[PDB]
């Protein structure tokens, strides 16, 4: 036969070198005699180089290999909501077949120059520190970067948890569907994550694509692109989806493993010289589409693990240059108690204020300023100081404390602005730092009991009129004195 | 009609077989017809036995050993001339704005030899930029290369857009903006703002040409796009006699892309991972930006510095080619000065008594030295107050503060964002205007009159409106 | 078609061309390809020749004819090359037509051995108050100009060449210094604008520009300094004196690394090949003063190296520092401030040019060398005391620091220099304001030229300072300082 079939020349280390397959397409899925699949990455003169999707004890020299005729693709559509799939879209949750609207290629061209509209709509994380200081808009790529065990996943997960507000409504323009890509994590971690989303009733709008620690590198390499197509169905049909790639370090690692094994030329840190293309292919697919094309959007929170905060390392550098900003998390801030351990002076949203609820932009425009000033004068915290430099100190200390938050408890926008109006505009400088916790708790509940009126208007108009600041000022000053 | 056959596919690297002596020269474009459209391949090597190694300009997914490959007869060619203006173009000269074909009168090969040593202009000369800060303190070389520093938050796209404007009105030259590895979201951003600002005018006349080579394009495409844009920018010089602007944003991403291609072709990396051809690759592009007897390409190139390490081979090699720099700063921005040029940081090789004339040089030098003495006072002005200022110093501090505000200027392009009319200030104005201020002829005009105005007469006029 | 004389191309990529045949080719022989592009036979094997291209690979296809030359890589030399600008293969690029050449020296020539040399003793006059007093350069010496990006490195070489106009108009055949300026990896415009500067100052007539610029294939840049050496050597070989400026060897070493990596040689320190020391060593060793038994001709090299951020311990800086006979190190920190030439005295040395210093400089610059390296002592530890004892040093130093400051394209005669350094060393400036030191020079030198031209003619003629002429220099300086 030979055009549609091949024989195995040699096999080992997840590579099978195959004779024949004369009509195979670059990156076509293939199928071996034992039942393991794999994909044609190297079309060479005498032979094809195929990376295995399964243990290579399954393949032997001489074994028959079959074309399948299709480039790797994946089932896409709402039939996947609440499901946990493998990288190829096979369900693993024990919940039976996945009904697909249709199938879609792993690799797909990102929306070009033209079919995009400027990012303008909030992705509400519900995290004061983020929403106030590093606002993400629908369409944006905002990196979550930091060392091990710093809070990277939490920042995505609490964002995912926050979408409850709109995903429990009927207006689909407000809804944010959720794709979480588990790459290179151990299985119980992904299982413990799903158990959490299930507990917070956030599975119902989420998709978990999980290519885990003990899976063939190509599957880990593929998971991000595969899920990006899953996420793209939403984008491409006038809806909005958030995708979290957790994390791109580990993907980079599997890609590298493939490349070295296929003997492609290594470079800095032994990554192939197209690793940057690997991530930009992937992250440019997040986009806000133009009105002409549905106005749908995909939004990406990629995760990157750093080593000793070394952003200069190859992959961190690639990704930091590809995205639209970093939320940068730090061990030290964490132990200090500053959780999320966001380092403000190092974090950015390149979209910024256009991605932010006008109400929050209003009270927190200054907030941007002060913490900046706080940080310059910071080391003075240790006596004989100005009335200028101590006021800076008093206010900062408090806003820093305001911005602390517990895990799994993202706040509504109408709960954030009054907390941040309070901070920014001096109404906290009297309260001792130990109580800014119990204060936030007590102030919101009080505001709920008595001033449900303005909470609603903040939530509904999203703006703050002049009467509203004056009302807010009244409700705040009345709570402080008591 | 020269045909070949794809014999190898590894990522963006494709090998192709041809018949004896029908082999395409290195750098020739090849074409495979996809259902997408067309896949272009650039010849890079003769491997022997009638095979060629080539680098893809788009994805190679779905390719098949044996697929027919047409030889285009030459390098990648791109539309040139007036018809390119106001259009968006990818590395291979295709329109990407969905506005139909560029029915340009020609197409030109992106790889071309630079002007000869004989063709070279002999005396460097200023490019009058209409912008105040720049023409006085760090003037652009005509034919030169200028590194534009600082990213978001500093009014960059407007600075760039006013240059396009002012040049097209004061010299009748057009512009080519080439985005190399630009973010697509930001390419779209820029297109929308060029229409808003008027520099792209889809009905009327357009001042600029857009060439984009995005991050998600394979290394080959990103390595090459700068050339595409340059080739468009060369034709306006060579056939139109125009002094032309070429914006390359970002030049660092051209180095990175070149680095990536070299790795993929199997070449041993040089120091720090960079290609071993880093300098010649840089040379091959930069050397084409120059003054000819016809006119000049003048390029403004955003430069990114990795880890702020000016010694990393990337910037080091880039800097060797820069004639001047324009440094936009958050520090100048926050003070209220538009554009946000740092007048003590922006430097020019042409700020020289020989090039600009002794009048020009003497003014600019004192302006700097004034603002420099003023900087080391910002410390003790905050502690000792103001009263403890000496005879010369008390006056120069109050004077620097006026000069610091005279360096700001309203841009004609920003008028839609601002409401303030825009002024294009002449060099003869700028030098003279600042020569008068320095001597003490306007020490009795309050500060706010120097802020956001054109030529000296605009300080006089506004000061007499700040009295009504 | 002979297989002995002719070849067919097997393959071409990465600057190399593989040719089948050429069975009578020599190791290091030039070849001509179908398109006119030339190459060198680098590696000679059973069944194929490895050829390095002197141009773009686009210019050589598989299956192409390649003809032998017979000639090892070489250039035209001779006196007919003055006022010319060639490329690395000696091809004329100034548009001024055929090169009129006395003949063809090879690119790789061996350096004269232990025997055929004499020590340096004759001045290469730079006209730069700092160089000639503190780092004197001999005729046959090799003095490295080294410093960061944009620190007046080229400026020293250039003003040295524009200073030669002095004797290069004269009858005396022996005090003539013919020049070779080598541009390696520079911008094409810079080199064109540089020629124009030699043209305006009427210096182009006694100089030769060899250029392999930024865009040209690496082996051309690699080759340029060598074919420049042969061009220079002619003068050395025929009882004359050539000055060669390699601008710069940094970029040559970079070109050579490209060539090396494309050829897959083991990369060492900073990915330079094992033999990068050797690349330069064989070059700079061709500078010599010859013994009268060989015609006394002298080649003098002023190579330029570019440090990165002031670091002289880098591989390429230390290699050339351990080839050359000294360094004029120019400093970013000084250049920023105005002290230009930015000759960091402490870190600068001439190793053989001692004998070559004009006595009159040596006399008024007596231990000015070791004082200035020691005004640097107090000036770095006074920023601690208001000491009357150490304040005259800080005011000799500060005045002398302004005294050695110099405008560009303004090289000075020996006679113009000695009285300036007399007025400094002997303290005649201590009462004069700092901001007027630059006005002192110009007023003083005029006052000297208008009245005391008898003293000025005499320093030039002798090359010495008689106790009479020093007792007179005292009178003229005190007289002008009082007014
Ligand atoms: N806002 C928060 N407040 C308090 N604790 C938190 C917060 N966010 C995260 N944590 C806890 O801090 C630890 C690390 O957070 P986690 O989200 O696991 O970070 P990570 O960067 O994913 N670490 P890893 O993935 O294991 O490299 C976990 O115990 C979290 O429960
Ligand atoms: N004695 C001098 N006085 C004042 N300016 C000078 C002097 N010498 C050189 N310069 C100027 O300083 C700048 C850089 O000097 P240059 O001679 O080009 O140094 P360089 O080391 O060749 N820089 P580059 O070749 O770009 O690495 C130029 O504008 C020179 O004209
Ligand atoms: Mg995690
Ligand atoms: Mg130089």
The DSSP code sequence of B103-114 is --S-EEES--PP
CATH fold label, C1-71: Elongation Factor Tu (Ef-tu); domain 3 (2.40.30)
Cβ proximity of C130 and C99 under 8 Å: no
C63–B21 CB contact, under 8 Å:
yes
> Is A263 tagged catalytic?
no
CATH number corresponding to B1-75: 2.40.10.170
Instruction: Using the mean position of ligand 1's atoms as its centre, give its distance from the Cα of residue A245 in Å.
Output: 16
User: H helices within C238-285, ranges in order?
Assistant: 249-262, 276-284
Cβ proximity of C135 and C365 under 8 Å: no
Rounded Cα–Cα distance for residues B155 and B5 (Å):
50
Paired tokens of C315: 């591989």
Q: What are the domain boundaries of chain B? A: 1-75, 76-350, 351-468
Which of C161, C251, C309, C408, when mutated, tests ligand 2's pocket best, judged by the most ligand atoms within 8 Å of its CB?
C408
Buried b (16+ CB within 10 A) or exposed e, C239-261: ebbbbbbbbbbbbbbbbbbbbbb
Rounded Cα–Cα distance for residues B102 and A86 (Å):
46
Residue ranges with strand state E in C317-408: 326-330, 349-350
The alpha carbon of residue B237 is apart from the nearest alpha carbon of chain C, in Å, by 17
- Binding-site residue ranges of B: 150-157
Specify the length of chain C in residues.
483
Rounded Cα–Cα distance for residues C421 and C428 (Å):
10
Rounded Cα–Cα distance for residues C121 and A22 (Å):
77
Tell me: domain B351-468, CATH 3.40.50.300, correct?
A: no
> A357-482, which class in CATH?
mainly alpha
Question: B197 φ, ψ to 5°?
Answer: -85, -15
Residues of chain C with Cβ-Cβ distance to B23 below 8 Å are 61-63
CB atoms within 10 A of CB B315: 21
Specify burial of residue A115 (Cβ count, 10 A radius: 0-12, 13-18, 19+): middle
Say whether residue B95 is in contact with chain A using an 8 A CB cutoff: no
The alpha carbon of residue B320 is apart from the nearest alpha carbon of chain C, in Å, by 8
CA C119 to chain centre: 19
Residue with tokens 């191309």: C9
Rounded Cα–Cα distance for residues C106 and C28 (Å):
11
Paired tokens of C89: 């293969």
Buried b (16+ CB within 10 A) or exposed e, B455-467: bbebbeebbeeee
Rounded Cα–Cα distance for residues B246 and A101 (Å):
47
Q: Output the CA angle A251-A257-A261, nearest 5 degrees.
A: 155
> Is B156 tagged catalytic?
yes
Best C9, C87, C187 member to test B by mutation, with max B CBs in 10 Å, is: C187
> Is B182 tagged catalytic?
yes
Specify burial of residue B165 (Cβ count, 10 A radius: 0-12, 13-18, 19+): buried
Say whether residue A280 is in contact with chain B using an 8 A CB cutoff: yes
Instruction: Work out the angle between the directed axes of helices A387-402 and A436-450 (0-180°, nearest 10).
Output: 70
Rounded Cα–Cα distance for residues A283 and B216 (Å):
8
Cβ proximity of B379 and B422 under 8 Å: no
The alpha carbon of residue A70 is apart from the nearest alpha carbon of chain B, in Å, by 9
CATH level 2 (architecture), domain B76-350: 3-Layer(aba) Sandwich (3.40)
Checking chain A for breaks where C and the next N are over 2.5 Å apart, the residues before them are 382
Q: What are the domain boundaries of chain A? A: 1-70, 71-356, 357-482
CATH number corresponding to C72-357: 3.40.50.300
C11–B321 CB contact, under 8 Å:
no
Paired tokens of B334: 């926050």
Best A6, A30, A113, A291 member to test B by mutation, with max B CBs in 10 Å, is: A113
Residue with tokens 């900003």: A325
Whether omega before B176 lies within 30 degrees of 0, making that bond cis, reads: no
Question: Could you say which DSSP state residue B413 is in?
Answer: G
Cβ-Cβ contacts under 8 Å between A and B: the total is 133
CA C94 to chain centre: 22
CA dist B304 → B251, B256, B334, C148, C263 (Å): 7, 11, 22, 21, 31
Determination technique for this entry: X-ray
Q: Which residues, 6+ apart, have CB-to-CB distance to C205 below 8 Å?
A: C82, C83, C168
H or E element: which one contains C52?
A: strand C48-53
Q: Nearest C-alpha to atom 25 of ligand 1 is from which residue?
A: A149
CATH fold label, A71-356: Rossmann fold (3.40.50)
Name residue A371's beta-bridge partners.
none
Paired tokens of B258: 């070149």
Question: Could you say which DSSP state residue B386 is in?
Answer: T
Chains B and A: 3 or more CB pairs within 8 Å of each other: yes
Instruction: Using the mean position of ligand 4's atoms as its centre, give its distance from the Cα of residue C153 in Å.
Output: 6
User: H helices within B265-390, ranges in order?
Assistant: 278-286, 313-319, 330-333, 353-356, 358-375, 380-383
In chain A, what is the greatest distance between 2 CA atoms, to the nearest angstrom? Answer: 89
Question: Could you say which DSSP state residue B117 is in?
Answer: T
Of the candidates B33, B99, B169, B183, the residue annotated as catalytic is B183
Say whether residue B305 is in contact with chain A using an 8 A CB cutoff: no
CB atoms within 10 A of CB B97: 18
Nearest CB to B276; choose among C61, C214, C262: C262
Of the candidates A350, A375, A395, A435, the residue annotated as catalytic is A350
Best B94, B215, B313, B333 member to test A by mutation, with max A CBs in 10 Å, is: B215
Instruction: Using the mean position of ligand 1's atoms as its centre, give its distance from the Cα of residue B433 in Å.
Output: 61
Answer yes or no: is the C-beta of A154 below 6 A from any ligand 1 atom. yes
CATH number corresponding to A1-70: 2.40.30.20
Instruction: Using the mean position of ligand 1's atoms as its centre, give its distance from the Cα of residue A347 in Å.
Output: 18
Name residue B42's beta-bridge partners.
B29, B55
B46–C11 CB contact, under 8 Å:
yes
Rounded Cα–Cα distance for residues A243 and A230 (Å):
10
| Half-sphere CA count of B50, side-chain side, radius 13 A | 11
The resolution, in angstroms to one decimal, equals: 3.0
Q: Which residues, 6+ apart, have CB-to-CB distance to C462 below 8 Å?
A: C360
| Half-sphere CA count of A243, side-chain side, radius 13 A | 34
Residues of A numbered 222-251 whose beta carbons fall under 8 angstroms of chain B's beta carbons: which are they?
none
Nearest CB to B219; choose among A111, A274, A324: A274
CATH level 2 (architecture), domain C358-483: Up-down Bundle (1.20)
- Nearest 10 degrees: Cα torsion B111, A276, B321, C304: -110
Rounded Cα–Cα distance for residues B106 and B79 (Å):
6
């Amino acid at each position: 036969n030979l055009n549609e079939t091949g024989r195995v020349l040699a096999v080992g280390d997840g590579i099978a070198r195959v004779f024949g397959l004369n009509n195979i397409q670059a990156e076509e899925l293939v199928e071996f005699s034992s039942g393991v699949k794999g994909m044609a990455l190297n079309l060479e003169p005498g032979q094809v180089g195929i990376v295995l999707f399964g243990s290579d004890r399954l393949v032997k020299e001489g074994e028959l290999v079959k074309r399948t005729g299709n480039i790797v693709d994946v089932p896409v559509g709402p039939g996947l909501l609440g499901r946990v799939v493998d990288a190829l879209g096979n369900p693993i949750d024990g919940k039976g077949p996945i009904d697909a609207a249709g199938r879609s290629r792993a690799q797909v061209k990102a929306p070009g120059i033209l079919p995009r509209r400027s990012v303008h709509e909030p992705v509400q994380t519900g995290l004061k520190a983020v929403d106030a200081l590093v606002p993400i808009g629908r369409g944006q790529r905002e990196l979550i970067i930091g060392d091990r065990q710093t809070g990277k996943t939490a920042v995505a997960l609490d964002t995912i948890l926050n979408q409850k507000r709109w995903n429990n409504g009927s207006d689909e323009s407000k809804k944010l569907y959720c794709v979480y890509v588990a790459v290179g994590q151990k299985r119980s971690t992904v299982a413990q994550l799903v158990q959490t989303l299930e507990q917070h009733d956030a599975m119902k709008y989420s998709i978990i694509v999980a290519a885990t620690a003990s899976e063939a590198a190509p599957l880990q390499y593929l998971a991000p692109f595969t899920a990006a197509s899953i996420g793209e169905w939403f984008r491409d049909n006038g809806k909005h989806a958030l995708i979290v790639y957790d994390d791109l370090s580990k993907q980079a690692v599997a890609y590298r493993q493939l490349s070295l094994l296929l003997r492609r030329p290594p470079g800095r840190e032994a990554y192939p010289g197209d690793v940057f293309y690997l991530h930009s292919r992937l992250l440019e697919r997040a986009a806000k589409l133009s009105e002409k094309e549905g106005s749908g959007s995909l939004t990406a929170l990629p995760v990157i693990e750093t080593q000793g905060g070394d952003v200069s390392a190859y992959i961190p550098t690639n990704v930091i240059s590809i995205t639209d900003g970093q939320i940068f998390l730090e061990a030290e801030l964490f132990y200090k108690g500053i959780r999320p351990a966001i380092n403000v002076g190092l974090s950015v949203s390149r979209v910024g204020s256009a991605a932010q609820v006008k109400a929050l932009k209003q009270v927190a425009g200054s907030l941007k300023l002060f913490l900046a000033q706080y940080r310059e004068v910071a080391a003075f915290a240790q006596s004989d100081l100005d009335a200028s430099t101590k006021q800076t100190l008093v206010r900062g200390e408090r806003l820093t404390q305001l911005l602390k938050q517990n895990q799994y408890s993202p706040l509504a926008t109408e709960e954030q602005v009054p907390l941040i109006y309070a901070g920014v505009n001096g109404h906290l400088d009297g309260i001792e730092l130990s109580r800014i916790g119990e204060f936030e708790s007590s102030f919101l509940s009080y505001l709920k009991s008595n001033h449900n009126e303005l909470l609603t208007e903040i939530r509904e108009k999203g703006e703050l009129s002049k009467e509203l600041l004056a009302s807010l000022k009244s409700a705040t000053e009345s709570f402080v004195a008591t | 009609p020269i045909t070949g056959k794809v014999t190898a596919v590894i990522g963006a690297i494709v090998d192709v077989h041809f018949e004896q002596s029908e082999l395409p020269a290195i750098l020739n474009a090849l074409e495979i017809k996809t259902p997408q459209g067309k896949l272009v391949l650039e010849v890079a090597q003769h491997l022997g036995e009638n095979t060629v190694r080539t680098i893809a300009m788009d994805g190679t997914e779905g390719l098949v050993r044996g697929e027919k490959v047409l030889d285009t007869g030459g390098p990648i060619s791109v539309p040139v001339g007036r018809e390119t203006l106001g259009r968006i173009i990818n590395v291979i000269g295709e329109p990407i704005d969905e506005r139909g074909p560029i029915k340009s009168k020609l197409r030109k090969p992106i790889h071309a030899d630079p002007p000869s040593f004989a063709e070279q202009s002999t005396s460097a000369e200023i490019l009058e930029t209409g912008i105040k800060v720049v023409d006085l303190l760090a003037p652009y070389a005509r034919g030169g290369k200028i590194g534009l520093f600082g990213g978001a938050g500093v009014g960059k796209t407007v600075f760039i857009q006013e240059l396009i404007n002012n040049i097209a009105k004061a010299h009748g030259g057009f512009s080519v903006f080439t985005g190399v590895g630009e973010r697509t979201r930001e390419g779209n951003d820029l297109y929308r703002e060029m229409k808003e600002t008027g520099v792209i005018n889809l009905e009327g006349e357009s001042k600029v040409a857009l060439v984009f080579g995005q991050m998600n394009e394979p290394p080959g495409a990103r390595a090459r796009v700068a050339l595409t844009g340059l080739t468009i920018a060369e034709y306006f010089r060579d056939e139109e006699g125009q002094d032309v602007l070429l914006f390359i944003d970002n030049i660092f991403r051209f180095t990175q892309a070149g680095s990536e291609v070299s790795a993929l072709l199997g070449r041993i990396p040089s120091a720090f991972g960079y290609q071993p051809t880093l300098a010649t690759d840089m040379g091959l592009l930069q050397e084409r930006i120059t003054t000819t007897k016809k006119g000049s390409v003048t390029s403004v190139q955003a430069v990114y510095v990795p880890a702020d390490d000016l010694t990393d081979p990337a910037p080091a090699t880039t800097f060797a080619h820069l004639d001047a720099t324009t440094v936009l700063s958050r520090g100048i921005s926050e003070l209220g000065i538009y554009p946000a040029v740092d007048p003590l940081d922006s430097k020019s090789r042409l700020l020289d008594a020989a090039v600009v004339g002794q009048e020009h040089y003497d003014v600019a030098s004192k302006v700097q030295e004034t603002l420099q003495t003023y900087k080391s006072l910002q410390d003790i002005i905050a502690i000792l107050g103001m009263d403890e200022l000496s005879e010369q110093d008390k006056l120069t501090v109050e004077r620097a503060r006026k000069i610091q505000r005279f360096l700001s200027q309203p841009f004609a392009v920003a008028e839609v964002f601002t409401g303030i009319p825009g002024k294009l200030v002449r060099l003869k104005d700028t030098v003279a205007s600042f020569k008068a201020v320095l001597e003490g002829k306007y020490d009795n005009i309050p500060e706010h009159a120097f802020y956001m105005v054109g030529g000296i007469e605009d300080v006089v006029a506004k000061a007499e409106k700040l009295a009504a």
